[PDB]
Amino acid sequence: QFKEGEHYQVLKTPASSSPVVSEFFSFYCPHCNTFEPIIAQLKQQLPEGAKFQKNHVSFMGGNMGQAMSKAYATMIALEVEDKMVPVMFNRIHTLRKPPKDEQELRQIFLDEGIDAAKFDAAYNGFAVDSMVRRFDKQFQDSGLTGVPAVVVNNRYLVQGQSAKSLDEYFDLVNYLLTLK
Ligand SMILES: C[C@H](CCC(=O)NCCS(=O)(=O)O)[C@H]1CC[C@H]2[C@@H]3[C@H](O)C[C@@H]4C[C@H](O)CC[C@]4(C)[C@H]3C[C@H](O)[C@]12C
């Protein structure tokens, strides 16, 4: 069914050690916003033992892009992705009130009930710094040129504009998870 060059491209990076689906996104990206409920269904139907990893990119949002990457990494660090990922998309794309500075970015978390001391320790901490650097290294090493992008096993770039239903898009990802 699924064919190289048509349904996916092989990237220059080496294959991952264990099965993983990696999404590269930005909270500033409208298509990433549209994609988020689709991602939520992809995750629910992934084969047992396959990991899913969202990676935020810093090149949208002007001088707030890197701060927003740290914000996403903070959602991972604090284990509040289920609450904060839809909140942040909604703030930028429905309310259309993107944060003008880091104070407003922090306030978006506080206004959802995140503890201020826990946010401050995470946002400026080593785990978040390490995760943002990893977002960036993967994006650079993979030769990615934009978002959204979905990479399977560190090496197979999905061409979503090949699927003819949501179920077929899922079949393509699941097939790629079996490649080395
Ligand atoms: C779930 C698919 C991809 C989701 C997405 O947001 N793309 C980005 C992912 S990626 O970075 O390209 O991997 C989308 C992309 C193309 C979509 C199809 C096309 O839009 C064409 C039709 C449109 C109809 O309204 C619904 C069926 C459909 C046949 C769509 C089903 C589904 O929504 C598809 C298959």
Numbering used by the authors: 2 to 181
From the paper:
DsbA enzymes catalyze oxidative folding of proteins that are secreted into the periplasm of Gram‐negative bacteria, and they are indispensable for the virulence of human pathogens such as Vibrio cholerae and Escherichia coli. DsbA enzymes retain a conserved tertiary structure, comprising a classical thioredoxin (TRX) domain with an inserted α‐helical domain. The TRX domain contains a pair of redox‐active cysteine residues in a CXXC motif located adjacent to a conserved cis‐proline residue. These features contribute to a hydrophobic patch of residues located in a surface groove of DsbA that is required for substrate recognition.
To identify the structural details of the interaction between TC and DsbA, we solved the crystal structures of TC in complex with oxidized EcDsbA and VcDsbA using molecular replacement at resolutions of 1.79 Å and 1.74 Å, respectively. TC also binds to the hydrophobic groove of VcDsbA but adopts a different binding pose compared to the complex with EcDsbA. The binding contributes to a buried SASA of 401 Å2, which is similar to that of the EcDsbA‐TC complex. The binding of TC does not cause major conformational change of VcDsbA. The hydrophobic groove of VcDsbA is truncated and flatter than the groove of EcDsbA as a result of a three‐residue deletion in loop L3 and a four‐residue deletion in helix H7. The VcDsbA‐TC complex shows that TC binds only to the right‐hand side of the VcDsbA groove where it makes hydrophobic contacts with A164, K165, S166 and L167 of loop L3. This results in the polar end of TC binding directly under H32 of the active site. Close inspection of the crystal structure also showed that TC makes additional hydrophobic contacts with R107 and D121 of a symmetry‐related molecule in the crystal lattice.
